[PDB]
């Protein structure tokens, strides 16, 4: 059932092997497979988030020219998604950092975002994601970086697209109200800001263990974020979530999605972490046809597709 505006999967791989910059395609990183994206589209997903490294797209200086090969493959991936009618989220998977240093220049970040947005300005099914999971950095800077991204995107004439903004504390939903209240002041002339939060279900919320705290931990961890969105007249998306292929996690996943389904005045949907071609036996692999989550979790996501 078409419960949410957006329901889909991350398509990870282009950000793999980040210790090697620029690194080598086919050895350090790989782009998503359009054929397996088609399969997930056939299952009813309509949004695919595509991580990539800023340093690989725009080397040495974020204000510089794109790397032709890496950009060409980003373009190809985005077009493979949007040509089918689905939404493609362009996600610089960079944690608010560039060459492992916090991005402290909003002006530099705005130029980076004009450069990226210019490549996709006429495509209304592209979604721009300012940066993945800002963390351990100045709270006002996170606000200013998100605004600079919005400004750069709209300055390129990319005005039809939604913009996913992300907050501090790894943009966690469960930590949102404790640190990210200032994010309410972001402005967009297109009025298409979506607050992208992430929520994992293991004890520390890192999403590194297949064990979930309890059968209700997901719905508990997004309640205050839901109220924050409603109180501030904002819209949100869960841009990453996952749980292990086990009984407790299946119930936590459905409980949290069932809760968002009764709160769609603020929740636009949810995006699983993650599919992609190099996950192998990853505990959360949504990659068709043999990913653990593709085999064992996707059946419980049927009511939302
Ligand atoms: O296919 C054959 C091919 O293999 C090449 O070598 C591969 C190797 O086979 C892969 O196992 C390896 O894969 C690892 C990636 O290098 C690494 O980047 C990736 O890191 C993951 C991490 O495991 C995961 O926890 C993390 O999730 C977080 C999100 O990123 C955050 O946004 C969110 O906040 O929290 C979640 C949960 O913590 O994601 C990152 C990626 O973003 O882990 C992979 C598995 O270990 O890659 C090698 C290449 O780099 C070989 O070189 C080729 O020759 C060969 O053909």
Q: If 0-12 CB within 10 Å is exposed, 13-18 middle and 19+ buried, where does residue 13 land? A: buried
C-alpha atoms less than 13 angstroms from C-alpha of 123 in its C-beta half-sphere: 23
Q: How many CB atoms lie within 10 A of CB 236?
A: 26
Q: What is the resolution of this structure in A?
A: 1.6
Q: Which residues are within 8 A (CB) of 160 and not within 5 positions of it... i.e. 6 or more apart? A: 124, 190
Q: How far is residue 208's CA from residue 55's CA, in Å, rounded to a whole number?
A: 25
The angle at the Cα of 82, spanning 115 to 270, to the nearest 5 degrees, equals: 95
Q: Which residues pair with 50 in a beta bridge?
A: 90
Which string of DSSP letters, residue by residue, matches 39-59?
Answer: HHHHHT--EEEEEE-HHHHS-
Distance CA 32, CA 135 (A): 26
Residue in the block written with tokens 């593709």? 294
Instruction: Report how far ligand 1's centroid is from the alpha carbon of 29 (Å).
Output: 8
Phi, psi of 91 (to 5 degrees): -120, 100
Are 279 and 293 in contact by the 8 Å Cβ rule? The answer is no
Q: How far from 210 is each of 13, 206, 246, 283, CA to CA, in Å?
A: 20, 11, 8, 6
Q: Would you list the DSSP string of 82-121? A: HTTT-EEEEEE--TTEETTEE---HHHHHHHHHHHHHHHT
Structural determination approach: X-ray
Residue 29 CA to residue 16 CA, distance in Å, equals: 5
Is beta strand 163-166 parallel, antiparallel or unpaired with respect to 6-11? unpaired
Q: Respond yes or no on whether the N-terminal peptide bond of residue 22 is cis (omega within 30° of 0).
A: yes
- State the DSSP H helix or E strand holding residue 225, giving kind and residue range, or none if neither: helix 223-231
95 CB within 6 A, ligand 1: no
Q: How far is the CA of 24 from the centre of ligand 1 (A)?
A: 14
Does the C-beta of 20 come closer than 6 Å to ligand 1? no
Residue 49 near residue 133 (C-beta atoms within 8 A): no
Which of the listed residues 36, 166, 278, 293 should we mutate to test ligand 1's pocket, taking the one with most ligand atoms within 8 A of CB?
Answer: 278
Q: CB 107: neighbour CB atoms within 10 A?
A: 12
277 ligand 1 Cβ < 6 A: no
Cβ neighbour number for residue 208 with a 10 Å cutoff: 11
Q: Whose CA is nearest to atom 1 of ligand 1?
A: 278
Q: What contacts 50, CB < 8 A, 6 or more positions away?
A: 10, 11, 14, 32, 74, 77, 78, 81, 88, 89, 90, 91
* Residue written as token pair 């966690």: 172
């Amino acid at each position: 059932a078409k419960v949410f505006q957006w329901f889909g999967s991350n398509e990870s791989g282009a950000e793999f092997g980040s210790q090697n910059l620029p690194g080598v395609e086919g050895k350090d990183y790989i782009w998503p497979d359009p054929n397996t994206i088609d399969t997930l589209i056939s299952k009813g997903m309509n949004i695919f988030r595509v991580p990539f490294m800023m340093e690989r797209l725009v080397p040495n200086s974020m204000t510089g020219s794109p790397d032709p090969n890496y950009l060409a493959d980003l373009i190809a991936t985005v077009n493979a998604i949007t040509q089918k009618g689905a939404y493609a989220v362009v996600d610089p998977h960079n944690y608010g950092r560039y060459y492992n240093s916090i991005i402290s220049s909003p002006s530099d970040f705005q130029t980076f975002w004009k450069t990226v947005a210019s490549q996709f300005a006429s495509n209304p099914l592209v979604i721009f994601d300012t940066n993945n999971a800002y963390h351990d950095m100045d709270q006002t800077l996170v606000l200013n970086l998100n605004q600079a991204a919005i400004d750069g995107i709209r300055s390129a004439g990319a005005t039809s697209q939604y913009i996913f903004v992300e907050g501090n504390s790894w943009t966690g939903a469960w930590t949102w109200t404790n640190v990210n209240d200032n994010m309410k002041s972001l402005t967009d002339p297109s009025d298409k800001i979506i607050y992208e939060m992430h929520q994992y279900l293991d004890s520390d919320g890192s999403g590194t263990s297949a064990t979930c705290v309890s059968s209700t931990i997901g719905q508990e961890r997004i309640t205050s974020a839901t109220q924050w969105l409603r109180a501030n007249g904002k819209k949100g998306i869960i841009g990453e979530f996952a749980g292990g292929a086990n009984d407790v996690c299946e119930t936590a996943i459905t409980g949290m999605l069932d809760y968002m389904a009764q709160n769609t005045d603020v929740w636009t949907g949810a995006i699983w972490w993650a599919a992609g071609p190099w996950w192998g036996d990853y505990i959360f692999s949504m990659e068709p046809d043999n990913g653990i989550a593709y085999q064992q979790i996707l059946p419980i996501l049927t009511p939302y597709l």
